[PDB]
Amino acid sequence: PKNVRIALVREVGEGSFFERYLAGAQSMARELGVTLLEATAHGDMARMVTMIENFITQRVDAIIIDHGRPDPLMPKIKEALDRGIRVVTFDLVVDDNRVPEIEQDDLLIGYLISKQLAVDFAGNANVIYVNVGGFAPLDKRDKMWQIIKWRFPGIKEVAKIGAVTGSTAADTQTRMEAAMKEKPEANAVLAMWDEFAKGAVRAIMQAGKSDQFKVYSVDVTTEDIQMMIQQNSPWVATVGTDSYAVGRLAVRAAAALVGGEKLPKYLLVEPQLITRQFLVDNNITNMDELVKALPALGESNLVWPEWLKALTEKN
């Protein structure tokens, strides 16, 4: 029934990754036949707190907290839990055994993409690093970049740029055009969100510098694929998941808790290395095609209790 109300509260909604996650979640809600309520704070942590309050006051069955920072949200999460509202997070670490945490295995992601850069350059590169602090997934990936710089000391960070603005791709493009003049020795880009990467790449192609750079990113969408497969694209590899299936999982997890199910504390969606060469060799032009060609992207597996699986069948 639609008596079951699940609220999705997000910090960030810009870009195809977040849009597809959102579609994912709506698609899963529709299959269960539950009511999904959405709210998005666009970077404003005060507004995010008040949105979570609205859902506590409305006494929803569950809240999904998407991104955010622990420090402001933590007492709101405790309050919600104490009132019988189930809580699951995506991309937020919470110290409470009642709250399953969903993530894309960000430590692995930060390791796979940073090593890919390292090995491709036989351990010697001048890297423009595109990332920013204060986001769970970004901080996790960051740690592994630091370990790659330790293991491969010829892999040098010559710049760190980037900010999450709500026009991130467009603002990263501008930054990257200044960064290339400031750091003419740079020959690689490591961008820890596809919206960062998109700006970097566009800056590279406009400058006519596609031969001078290799770009390594996180995440994959049809837009990323389209940009990867362009002739002379400097965009070499990305690591990520189908965010569509991640948003479904988020809603399934929430529904499972409402049904009284006890979930694992950590729900790790397994990320995949996707190279330009793999896409080009396989004539992949969109995500349908990609998940067909790399089926490890399309995996069923997490959080399908029998009752819930049976329920989706019915509808």
Q: Which stretches of the chain bind ligand SR1, using CB under 6 A? A: 12, 17, 91, 104, 135, 137-138, 164, 193, 218-219
122 is a contact residue toward a second copy (CB under 8 A): yes
Residue placing its CB nearer to ligand SR1 in the complex, 110 or 234: 110
Stretch that binds a second copy, among 140-148, 171-179, 203-211, 240-248 (CB under 8 A): 140-148
Q: CA-CA distances (angstroms) from residue 220 to 94, 186, 217, 243, 244?
A: 27, 24, 9, 8, 11
Instruction: Compare residues 49 and 147 and give the one whose CB is closer to a second copy.
Output: 147
Task: Give all strands of the β-sheet with 101-103 in edge-to-edge order.
Answer: 35-40, 5-10, 62-66, 86-90, 101-103, 266-268
Q: Could you say which of 33, 43, 70, 123 contacts a second copy (CB under 8 A)?
A: 123
Is 112 or 189 the residue whose CB approaches a second copy more closely?
112
From residue 180, alpha-carbon distances to 100, 150, 185, 206, 234 in Å are 42, 25, 8, 12, 14
Nearest CB to a second copy, comparing residues 18 and 111: 111
Shortest Å, Cβ 181 to ligand SR1: 26
- The answer to whether the beta carbons of residues 274 and 229 sit under 8 Å apart is no
Q: Select 266 or 307, whichever has its Cβ closest to a second copy.
A: 266
- Give the footprint of a second copy on residues 144-173 (CB under 8 A): 144, 147-148, 150-151, 153-154
Applying CB under 8 A, which of residues 45, 56, 81, 107 lies at the interface with a second copy?
A: 107
Distance between first and last Cα of the chain: 11
Cα–Cα separations (whole angstroms), residue 18 to 21, 42, 55, 237, 252: 5, 12, 21, 20, 17
The answer to whether residue 115 forms part of the interface with a second copy (CB under 8 A) is yes
| DSSP per-residue string spanning 259-309 | TTPPPPSEEEPPPEEEEHHHHHHHT--SHHHHHHHSGGGS---SS--HHHH
Closest distance to a second copy from the beta carbon of 1 (Å) = 30
Of residues 229-268, those binding a second copy (CB under 8 A): 264-266, 268
Instruction: Tell me which of 44, 83, 93, 310 binds a second copy, using CB under 8 A.
Output: 93
How many CB atoms are closer than 10 A to CB 133? 9
Shortest distance (Å) from residue 249 CB to a second copy: 17
State the nearest-atom distance from the C-beta of 91 to ligand SR1, in Å: 5
How is the chain split among helix, strand and coil, in percent rounded to 5? 50, 20, 30
What is the rounded CA–CA span in Å between residue 297 and residue 59? 35
Taking CB within 5 to 8 Å according to partner kind, which of a second copy, ligand SR1, none is near residue 140? a second copy
Beta carbon nearer to a second copy, 73 or 203: 73
With tokens 């110290």, the residue in question is 95
Least distance CB 138 / ligand SR1 (angstroms): 5
Minimum CB separation of residue 264 from a second copy in Å reads: 7
Contact 88, 251 (CB under 8 A): no
Instruction: Give the footprint of a second copy on this chain (CB under 8 A).
Output: 93, 95, 97, 107-108, 111, 115, 118-119, 122-124, 140, 143-144, 147-148, 150-151, 153-154, 264-266, 268
